[model samples]
Target: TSSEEEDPLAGISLPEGVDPSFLAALPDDIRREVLQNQLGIRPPTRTAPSTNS
Candidate 1:
């Protein structure tokens, strides 16, 4: 059964027990950012101090 086809999370695996449905709800760009954060491709910005210009 090729039931796993058409998966939005194809070629990607989330850490821990993340729901694929919840991740699918996020926009493509945002979802990529989230995956990048998890994979350490980029640092997590949420804990970074904001620079006041």
Candidate 2:
């Protein structure tokens, strides 16, 4: 998308006892490419539409 990258979880909060080591196992750029790819498709969900003007 943008020449500037985006963080898939840049806006989220907290963690679920992550195992970053698994990600560490992947090639440096590989993991990021995958993350950006997934994030490109997913940018969080809206609980409900805005109701204000």
Candidate 3:
């Protein structure tokens, strides 16, 4: 598939995974800011999700 056929969320790949609706709801400018901030800072460490929680 070419760029036109690519996923819209391709630009903002989140490590904690993302809600499909979350991305769909974000405005283009907000998405860009989020991406920029994401690049400038790192998220906390990762751990396995607890099914018991």
Candidate 4:
């Protein structure tokens, strides 16, 4: 048994031949949008409200 195969983002479907280093450096929110866009999934909803009044 070995643990080298363990992946941090194993739950997500990454692009074919995608650069692991790029993903690692990308911000979590930005990376999520990139993945969804590449996969042609529904547009991301506005989860973060900008109004702070």
Candidate 5:
């Protein structure tokens, strides 16, 4: 499933001395919009899938 694909942003190691809170402050809606636009499709459901794998 498309949802199972690894996040493009995952496992990124931030440079030392960077403030993690700055990264965390991004709004969820904005992040969703970015993912939707980049993926070229809207998510079919509102909820994330459960991990049963």
Candidate 6:
């Protein structure tokens, strides 16, 4: 697949001098959710339904 066809995360270019440790400091669940959402990947389980019922 061409570069444009690839998922953005697949070719993500982090800013120079960014620290992985900063990301690692985030709670595991929060980090996982953010990554999954950003990458267009779904979590294994469905999120709780909206409470507007």
Best lDDT among the predictions, by candidate number: 4
The candidate with the higher lDDT, 1 or 2, is 1
TM-score to true structure, per model: 0.36, 0.33, 0.32, 0.39, 0.30, 0.33
Candidate number of the best TM-score: 4
Worst 10 residues of 2 by lDDT: 12-21
> By TM-score, is 3 or 6 better?
6
lDDT (10s digit) by residue, model 3, range 1-53 = 12233254666455344333444465556654554355443344536443222
lDDT of 6 by residue, 1-53 (tens): 12223233555543343333444555557655555455544435557543222
Ranking of models by TM-score: 4, 1, 6, 2, 3, 5
Candidate 5 lDDT, tens digit per residue, 1-53?
12333333575443334333433465556645544554434345545444221
Give the clashing residue pairs of candidate 3, or none: none
Against the unseen true structure, what C-alpha lDDT does each candidate score? Answer: 0.50, 0.43, 0.45, 0.50, 0.43, 0.44
Task: Give the Å shift of residue 34 in candidate 5.
Answer: 0.2
For model 1, state the Cα shift of residue 7 in Å. Answer: 8.0
Name model 4 segments beyond 4 Å from true: 1-13, 41-53
TM-score of 2: 0.33
Q: Please list all clashing residue pairs in model 4, or write none if there are none.
A: none
Instruction: Summarize candidate 4's per-residue lDDT along 6-45 as a digit string, tens digits.
Output: 2547654455654445555655576556655565443346
lDDT, model 1: 0.50
Name the runs in model 2 displaced over 4 angstroms.
1-19, 41-53
lDDT of 1 by residue, 1-53 (tens): 22333354575545554445545655557656656555544324555443221
Clashes of each: 0, 0, 0, 0, 0, 0
